[PDB]
Write a protein that binds this ligand. Structure first.
Ligand SMILES: Cc1ccc(-c2cc(C(=O)O)c3c(c2)ncn3CCc2ccccc2)c(Cl)c1
Ligand SMILES: [Zn+2]
Length: 353
């Protein structure tokens, strides 16, 4: 039961120094790219966005896979929703500025910005032989010494009120309080470019709303009680359940690598499902450390439901379905449904030693 799960968590602790070292490699490469981008007139305002809950500038999204976000302070943004998608928007500037070279009419071109961003980085990773860095295809994906991959996301920062599509999102009122929800909604939001001809290209220059910076505000301040996990009397298992969900997905993706059925699923999906379960189970007494196995089952059952019903709401944008057929094909969701069901009904053989 829970003892198999606690053993998994104890084993995860053994790779803490591998992780810390890789995160240091990433940090060096990114600092170097940061000062070069700052030379460019378009990217003079670039900086690192703190999104990690463990390491500040670097978020780990899988073993030796790391995520980094470069933000661009961008004033006076005017948004126009693209074809009722709730998450994708055209970016204009309320009535010159450094980004003027990327305009196509009033509209800021995602693909032109991405193109110069990529070009500057690809040119720059050529030029330090202290580490070996190439570029794969997240604006850019790097590979460091053929082992550690870094996804680098460029994002516009907007200090305006959040778009109306988020009005019913971040549904934390009954768990973390309406006061906290108000404070978090005073923070900036971010727009990440979607190339006009990439993916199944819209043929438009649209940007997706991004709230990845909110994760650390909540994951490390996660209780109904303000002192949850700050003393020995208030120990919950929220963080451990999330770790186990991520590890479940990681291990399944590894086992199904022969035909890569699970390529489209990521830790973002797991995290989104996990925080929906936090909304559903707002009391700290529902996450008692002694109940690790039941709490994990709660999390897996909800993820399974999302898979079977092909529905996983964006935590911030309820009308945006992360599991829509536009984003993940039906056979992928049907396939993972079957595997998650098997693991849950058989006490997670994927965690066996
Ligand atoms: C309580 C809470 C707080 C934050 C998050 C959160 C948000 C985002 C986001 O909206 O950017 C995340 C993320 C985690 N992990 C990865 N991304 C990035 C997604 C993304 C964005 C744009 C294009 C493609 C993909 C969650 Cl689920 C819950
Ligand atoms: Zn806690």
């Amino acid at each position: 039961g829970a003892s198999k799960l606690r053993a998994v968590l104890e084993k995860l602790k053994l790779s803490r120094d591998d992780i810390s070292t890789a995160a240091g490699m990433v940090k060096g490469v990114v600092d170097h790219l940061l000062l070069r981008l700052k030379c460019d007139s378009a990217f003079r305002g670039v900086g690192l966005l703190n999104t990690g809950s463990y390491y500040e500038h670097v978020k780990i999204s899988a073993p030796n896979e790391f995520d980094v976000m470069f933000k661009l302070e961008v004033p006076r943004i005017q948004l126009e929703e693209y074809s009722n998608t709730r998450a994708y928007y055209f970016v204009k500037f309320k009535r010159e500025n450094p980004l003027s070279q990327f305009l196509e009419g009033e509209i800021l071109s995602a693909s032109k910005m991405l193109s110069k961003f990529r070009k500057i980085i690809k040119e720059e990773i050529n030029d330090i032989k202290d580490t070996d860095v190439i570029m794969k295809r997240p604006a850019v994906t790097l590979l460091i010494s053929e082992k550690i991959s870094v996804d680098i996301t460029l994002a516009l920062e907007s200090k305006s009120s959040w778009p109306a599509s988020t009005q019913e999102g971040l549904r934390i009122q009954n768990w973390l309080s309406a006061k906290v929800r108000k404070q978090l909604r005073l923070k900036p939001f971010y727009l990440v470019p979607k190339h006009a001809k990439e993916g199944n290209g819209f043929q438009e220059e649209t940007w997706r709303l991004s709230f990845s910076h909110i994760e650390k505000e909540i994951l490390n301040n996660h209780g109904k009680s303000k002192t949850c996990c700050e003393n020995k009397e208030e120990k919950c298992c929220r963080k451990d359940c999330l770790k186990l969900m991520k590890y479940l997905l990681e291990q399944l993706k590894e086992r199904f690598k022969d035909k890569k059925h699970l390529d489209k699923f990521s830790s973002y999906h797991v995290k989104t499902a996990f925080f929906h379960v936090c909304t559903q189970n707002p009391q700290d007494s529902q996450w008692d450390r002694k109940d690790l196995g039941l709490c994990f089952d709660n999390c897996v059952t909800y993820f399974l439901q999302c898979l079977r019903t092909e529905k996983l709401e964006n935590y911030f944008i309820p009308e945006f379905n992360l599991f829509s057929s536009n984003l993940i094909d039906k056979r992928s969701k049907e396939f993972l449904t079957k595997q998650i069901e098997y693991e849950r009904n058989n006490e997670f053989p994927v965690f066996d030693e």
